[PDB]
Design a protein around this ligand. Sequence first.
Ligand code: HEM
Ligand SMILES: O=N[O-]
Length: 153
Amino acid sequence: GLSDGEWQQVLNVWGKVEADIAGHGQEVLIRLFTGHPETLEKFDKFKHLKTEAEMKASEDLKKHGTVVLTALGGILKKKGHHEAELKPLAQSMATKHKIPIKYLEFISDAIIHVLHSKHPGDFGADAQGAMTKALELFRNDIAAKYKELGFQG
Ligand code: HEM
Ligand SMILES: O=N[O-]
């Protein structure tokens, strides 16, 4: 779990994301796709994107970044009390989309990276630590649902 102070840091940082959710969502997916091109292959609707210029130009990629960070932000605002929201998300990621838990680690690290890139000097050690714990909790809770299903990849 996260402490009260840690949750407040998380949601303080998330204010930055909410001021430009589509821009943050776009940069997160680009970082994921460029750092880990295997991840692009899980998206039939993005595997036409050969270059980062094509990614940056894709309005549908920004639209999906919005969908992703909206879902994450709603879960974050539950401050760990997210079983109802997280369970069907997890089951969809496993059974529908076949997303290995490693890709969830990749995108967690990508969120941290984009935060530093967009807010250099304004995402301090306490903020990063809090966000990291929140993303770990998210990832670990999804991992429990994956184990229930026997899902690996
Ligand atoms: C913060 C982590 C994530 C969140 C909150 C998230 C959320 C969502 C949501 C809300 C949808 C649409 C609803 C659904 O189909 O269940 C979706 C679709 C999808 N997600 Fe994710 N996702 C995450 C991470 C990932 C990762 C790491 C991958 C692959 C590497 C992935 C691949 C997909 C794909 C392929 C779809 C279907 C897209 C389409 O054709 O419309 N997601 N995600
Ligand atoms: O919640 N104060 O660590």
